[PDB]
Design an enzyme around this catalytic site. Structure first.
Site, short mmCIF file in Angstrom:
data_model
loop_
_atom_site.label_atom_id
_atom_site.label_comp_id
_atom_site.label_asym_id
_atom_site.label_seq_id
_atom_site.Cartn_x
_atom_site.Cartn_y
_atom_site.Cartn_z
N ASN A 25 -48.14 17.48 -68.34
CA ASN A 25 -46.73 17.63 -67.97
C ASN A 25 -45.87 17.02 -69.08
OD1 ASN A 25 -44.36 18.15 -66.64
ND2 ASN A 25 -44.58 16.45 -65.19
N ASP A 26 -45.76 17.76 -70.18
CA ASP A 26 -44.85 17.37 -71.25
C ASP A 26 -43.46 17.89 -70.93
OD1 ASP A 26 -44.85 16.09 -74.08
OD2 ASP A 26 -43.77 17.97 -74.39
N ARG B 101 -37.58 6.80 -49.86
CA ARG B 101 -36.64 6.75 -50.96
C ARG B 101 -35.38 7.54 -50.61
NH1 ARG B 101 -41.34 8.63 -55.26
NH2 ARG B 101 -42.53 6.67 -55.24
N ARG C 71 -37.87 6.83 -62.42
CA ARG C 71 -37.68 7.08 -61.00
C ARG C 71 -36.99 5.90 -60.32
NH1 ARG C 71 -43.02 9.06 -58.78
NH2 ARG C 71 -43.51 6.82 -58.79
N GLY D 9 -45.38 13.51 -62.68
CA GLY D 9 -44.39 14.54 -62.44
C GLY D 9 -44.84 15.58 -61.44
N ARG E 216 -48.58 0.09 -59.79
CA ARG E 216 -48.78 1.49 -60.14
C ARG E 216 -49.19 1.64 -61.60
NH1 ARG E 216 -45.57 5.26 -56.75
NH2 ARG E 216 -45.22 4.18 -54.76
N1 LIG Z 1 -41.84 17.19 -67.69
C1 LIG Z 1 -41.05 16.10 -67.47
N2 LIG Z 1 -40.25 15.62 -68.44
C2 LIG Z 1 -39.46 14.54 -68.24
N3 LIG Z 1 -39.41 13.87 -67.08
C3 LIG Z 1 -40.17 14.25 -66.03
C4 LIG Z 1 -41.05 15.41 -66.17
N4 LIG Z 1 -41.68 15.56 -64.98
C5 LIG Z 1 -41.24 14.58 -64.16
N5 LIG Z 1 -40.34 13.80 -64.78
C6 LIG Z 1 -39.65 12.62 -64.20
O1 LIG Z 1 -40.60 11.60 -63.88
C7 LIG Z 1 -40.17 10.90 -62.70
C8 LIG Z 1 -41.32 10.77 -61.72
O2 LIG Z 1 -41.87 12.07 -61.49
P1 LIG Z 1 -42.65 12.42 -60.12
O3 LIG Z 1 -42.56 13.91 -59.89
O4 LIG Z 1 -42.23 11.44 -59.04
O5 LIG Z 1 -44.15 12.04 -60.56
P2 LIG Z 1 -45.34 11.89 -59.49
O6 LIG Z 1 -44.95 12.85 -58.39
O7 LIG Z 1 -46.58 12.31 -60.25
O8 LIG Z 1 -45.31 10.43 -59.09
C9 LIG Z 1 -39.03 11.70 -62.09
O9 LIG Z 1 -37.83 10.94 -62.25
C10 LIG Z 1 -38.93 12.97 -62.91
O10 LIG Z 1 -37.56 13.29 -63.15
N1 LIG Z 2 -55.15 9.53 -50.57
C1 LIG Z 2 -53.87 9.93 -50.37
N2 LIG Z 2 -52.93 9.66 -51.30
C2 LIG Z 2 -51.65 10.05 -51.10
C3 LIG Z 2 -51.31 10.73 -49.95
N3 LIG Z 2 -49.99 11.00 -50.02
C4 LIG Z 2 -49.52 10.50 -51.19
N4 LIG Z 2 -50.54 9.92 -51.83
C5 LIG Z 2 -50.50 9.28 -53.15
O1 LIG Z 2 -49.98 7.98 -53.04
C6 LIG Z 2 -49.35 7.61 -54.30
C7 LIG Z 2 -47.96 7.08 -54.02
O2 LIG Z 2 -46.98 8.11 -54.12
P1 LIG Z 2 -45.46 7.83 -53.76
O3 LIG Z 2 -45.45 6.47 -53.10
O4 LIG Z 2 -44.77 7.89 -55.11
O5 LIG Z 2 -45.10 8.98 -52.85
C8 LIG Z 2 -49.40 8.87 -55.18
O6 LIG Z 2 -50.54 8.82 -56.03
C9 LIG Z 2 -49.60 9.98 -54.15
O7 LIG Z 2 -50.19 11.16 -54.66
C10 LIG Z 2 -52.29 11.00 -49.01
O8 LIG Z 2 -52.01 11.61 -47.96
N5 LIG Z 2 -53.55 10.59 -49.25
#
Ligand SMILES: Nc1ncnc2c1ncn2[C@@H]1O[C@H](COP(=O)(O)OP(=O)(O)O)[C@@H](O)[C@H]1O
Ligand SMILES: Nc1nc2c(ncn2[C@@H]2O[C@H](COP(=O)(O)O)[C@@H](O)[C@H]2O)c(=O)[nH]1
Length: 191
Positions: free
Chosen positions: A168-169, A41, A134, A13, A145
């Site tokens: 992150n609850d 996305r 997501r 999150g 992942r």
């Molecule tokens: N505290 C929370 N409670 C419920 N759902 C959450 C919370 N934080 C994030 N999410 C959900 O989890 C999904 C992925 O979160 P994201 O911010 O992309 O995680 P990360 O950035 O660590 O990959 C999103 O759809 C978001 O709505």
């Molecule tokens: N090492 C590294 N990891 C990254 C960078 N940007 C995003 N990530 C990581 O790549 C992963 C994929 O994230 P997403 O594809 O959901 O954006 C996540 O763990 C995110 O934090 C970066 O610039 N460097």
């Protein structure tokens, strides 16, 4: 003003928490726009959430020494360019980093001197639930992942890698903790 490295397992999150921080405190926080080779996305924007490039452009930037750090995650390349960090520092704001666990170890060797904040799910069960909620990943990349989640949650508890660990609850609960955890950087950025 020390940069902020936000990391943890994918799906915890941290992007959601960071968007709430950059919207409320846009005047003091700046986001590091990473390069990535994965497809954007819906809702993402080039030059804002990421610099979306092909693998060839990404590799060429690496050959040109453009990146402080890069890494591969679930079949895609991600990198923190020098430009991304200097662009925020040229705005007189706190550079926030969203990187994976390999990115923490890379930045640890640099001179960035950041504060490292782990964002953790309440459990592996909720983590998988959030990765699938997501719904932005194919089934093979979703499982990749998941495979990296266990080792990311373990390392997320180690004090050699992080200065703060946040569960992150609830989003409201986690957000107040993050702001309180960043009080010293918010203080330095405003003074
Ligand atoms: N505290 C929370 N409670 C419920 N759902 C959450 C919370 N934080 C994030 N999410 C959900 O989890 C999904 C992925 O979160 P994201 O911010 O992309 O995680 P990360 O950035 O660590 O990959 C999103 O759809 C978001 O709505
Ligand atoms: N090492 C590294 N990891 C990254 C960078 N940007 C995003 N990530 C990581 O790549 C992963 C994929 O994230 P997403 O594809 O959901 O954006 C996540 O763990 C995110 O934090 C970066 O610039 N460097």
């Amino acid at each position: 003003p020390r940069p902020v490295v936000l990391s943890g397992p994918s799906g915890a999150g941290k992007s959601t928490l960071l968007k709430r921080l950059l919207q409320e405190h846009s005047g003091i926080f700046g986001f590091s726009v990473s390069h990535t080779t994965r497809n954007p996305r819906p809702g993402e924007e080039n030059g804002k959430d990421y610099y979306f490039v092909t693998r060839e452009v990404m590799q060429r930037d690496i050959a040109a020494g453009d990146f402080i750090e890069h890494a591969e995650f679930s079949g895609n390349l991600y990198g923190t360019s020098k430009v991304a960090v200097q662009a925020v520092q040229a705005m007189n704001r706190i550079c926030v980093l969203d990187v994976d666990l390999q990115g923490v170890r890379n930045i640890k060797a640099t001179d960035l001197r950041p504060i490292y904040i782990s964002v953790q799910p309440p459990s592996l069960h909720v983590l998988e639930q959030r990765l699938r909620q997501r719904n932005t990943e194919t089934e093979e990349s979703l499982v990749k992942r998941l495979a990296a989640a266990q080792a990311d949650m373990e390392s997320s508890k180690e004090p050699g890698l992080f200065d703060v660990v946040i569960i992150n609850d609830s989003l409201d609960q986690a957000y107040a903790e993050l702001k309180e955890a960043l009080s010293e950087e918010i203080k330095k950025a405003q003074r």
